[PDB]
Design goal:
Chain B: It comes from Influenza A virus (A/Denver/1957(H1N1)). Chain B: This is Hemagglutinin HA1 chain. It is classed as viral protein. The entry lists the keywords niaid, structural genomics, influenza virus, vaccine development, broadly neutralizing antibody, strain-specific neutralization, influenzavirus, viral protein. This is part of a larger assembly, with 2 copies of chain A and 3 copies of chain C (157 residues). With 51 residues, chain A is mostly beta strands. Chain A contains no helices and 7 strands. In chain A, a hairpin with a 2-residue loop joins strand 2 and strand 3. Chain A is elongated and about 50 Å long. With 157 residues, chain C is mainly α. The longest helix of chain C has 52 residues. Helix content of chain C is 51%, strand content 11%. Bound molecules: a molecule of 4 linked components (NAG-NAG-BMA-MAN) and a molecule of 3 linked components (NAG-NAG-BMA). A molecule of 4 linked components (NAG-NAG-BMA-MAN) binds next to loops of chain B. A molecule of 3 linked components (NAG-NAG-BMA) binds next to loops of chain B.
Chain lengths: 51, 105, 157, 157, 157
């Protein structure tokens, strides 16, 4: 495709702003480090308690 | 009276902590690239060399099933396909094959 | 501390403007107020914290792949060992970093409201019954001209 | 905080049942009580924390060894460099993780008792002299029917 | 907590002797005093903390360099990948460790002064107006024989 990326992987390209990626371990470019992880979600706020 | 409190939302976002799993949270951001775009893209401003039904062996030798190069080209990486079988049509060993592939990438 | 989900139990849904503030029942506006400093210093600090977990990782150009012939299995395995090694390190360090710094973030809000609560109780002194819920029964139920000045933390006697 | 080994000096040996609670001298049972919520929420959180330092490390099958002939010294050294590299990383990251999260664990108990102490002082108000040791002289020395209800945090005036 | 740069605003320049202590205006010496225990336990703890970030990294003898001929580009790149890998790990883990443990160090001083302030307010009780600045107006302006004994935390009624 007529796209540009910083990181191409064997199934497609990936946005490389995040520091971790789990698409594929064998990348090409300036890529997020590969992790076997499935969720890496970080908190910005508080805990919802609207009962 | 007068109280002192904090914010709450209708957000479904759940995260994990060291002291308790699956804490529901007001605001969060992702650190994990989970999706890819499904397309071969240009790298460092260059498009990849696409060999098609050929492999590097077939392309650099001029295997007649390979498309010959028309203009001068640059490329940032090489793209092969799972069905790129056309290499050495007359059988034999290709000296330092992997090394050459790496040096032509 | 024990401010969040301790003695201030649940939270309020009515603050479209910020993360921390007050709820006053006196003789007028029953609304909520944001503490544009207690809050705009937290967002100045959290966005600073996310942006540094993101951007402190500089990474060079790297082609991870390596190809080996059938008499190079040892190299192939050495290479696979290196890739498994990094995977194991980044997977473990990331999962735990997320886990730990999430708790460090939830505490940040405890330490913030506990200081905002202590910013008015250590200021109003014995001019209200200090209800354990996180709320103060006013002796001279301040109008909207005064209550908006406790936000700045300004009283008299 | 300063609760543990600060103004509550030493600790009690007489609590076979839990980690946190109370000691009452009134007119009857001189024993100790466990706070089955202040405690069973800590164990729910600590065992959660150990189990994630343990189990967040998934590791694949790996044969670390590599064998090289006398004209492959460079590979041998490259391989040794990789093994030394991981050793240095896991040794440093583990030693410090143990060091830091141990302090994070000892603070957890400070923040817990300080909130349990503040769960009764911010509830009993001026119905006892607030002795700095972490103890309260009762004005109407509650019997065993009442004292067992302060555990739930329930009083009157 | 909110002690440092919260309700104790700025700091004092006049303490050549230590990190924490007191400033008394009564009828004599207007100087400052160091808390040789509140301070000599912090330095015992901080120097312990630096010395373990320094010295917990044991590292073996290592010659990082590798030389490859023009038909060994793959090895050359595998080697470069290993060096880039470590660089990325140590650069990211160090930058963040410095970032995080610096905040853990600045909090340490909050928790220390807040406990020193609470070491005298939870001791003097209602024998002074508890000014929010972090300072106490004395009812019987103690001379230099008494004030030097509040440092040890020793009073009467
Ligand atoms: C470019 O690539 C294509 C494939 O992508 C390639 O076409 C393939 O050629 C081979 C060899 O000519 C074909 O395989 C033969 O198929 C016939 C049946 O049609 C068999 O009889 C042949 O038998 C041989 O192999 C047997 C064992 O498998 C032996 O028992 C026997 O004695 C023979 O040695 C053989 O299997 C193959 O079918 C095609 N594939 C396709 C999709 O057409 C083409 O030749 C390549 N060209 C160049 C220039 O590289
Ligand atoms: C086929 O070869 C010709 C030249 O033999 C290539 O032309 C080159 O095209 C690039 C495209 O940008 C030019 O690059 C630019 O050069 C300037 C300096 O002149 C530099 O400052 C810019 O940053 C940029 O890199 C390059 O100058 C130009 N060369 C000549 C001699 O004109 C052409 O690109 C080749 N074709 C393909 C498909 O690669």
């Amino acid at each position: 495709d007529e796209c540009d990326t910083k990181c191409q992987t064997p199934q497609g390209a990936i946005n490389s702003s995040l520091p971790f990626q789990n698409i594929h371990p064998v990348t090409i470019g300036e890529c997020p480090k590969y992790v076997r992880s499935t969720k890496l979600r970080m908190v910005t706020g508080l805990r919802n308690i609207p009962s | 009276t007068i109280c002192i409190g904090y914010h709450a939302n209708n957000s479904t976002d759940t995260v994990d902590t060291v002291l308790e799993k699956n804490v529901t949270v007001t605001h969060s951001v992702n650190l994990l690239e989970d999706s890819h775009n499904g397309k071969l893209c240009r790298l460092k401003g260059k498009a990849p060399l696409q060999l098609g039904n050929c492999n590097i062996a077939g392309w650099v030798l001029g295997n007649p099933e390979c498309e010959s190069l028309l203009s001068n080209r640059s490329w940032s990486y090489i793209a092969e396909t799972p069905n790129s079988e056309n290499g050495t049509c007359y059988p034999g060993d290709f000296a330092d094959y992997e090394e050459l592939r790496e040096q032509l990438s | 501390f024990g401010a969040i989900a301790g003695f201030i139990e649940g939270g309020w849904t009515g603050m479209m403007d910020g993360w921390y503030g007050y709820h006053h029942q006196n003789e007028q506006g029953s609304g909520y107020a944001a503490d544009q400093k207690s809050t705009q210093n937290a967002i100045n600090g959290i966005t600073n914290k996310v942006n540094s977990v993101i951007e402190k990782m500089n990474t060079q150009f790297t082609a991870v792949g390596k190809e080996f012939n059938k008499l190079e299995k040892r190299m192939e395995n050495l290479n696979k060992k290196v890739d498994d090694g990094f995977m194991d390190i980044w997977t473990y360090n990331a999962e735990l970093l997320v886990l730990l710094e999430n708790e460090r973030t939830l505490d940040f809000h405890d330490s913030n409201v506990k200081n905002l609560y202590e910013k008015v109780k250590n200021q109003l002194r014995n001019n209200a019954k200090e209800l354990g819920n996180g709320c103060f029964e006013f002796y001279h139920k301040c109008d909207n001209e005064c209550m908006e000045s406790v936000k700045n933390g300004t009283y008299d006697y």
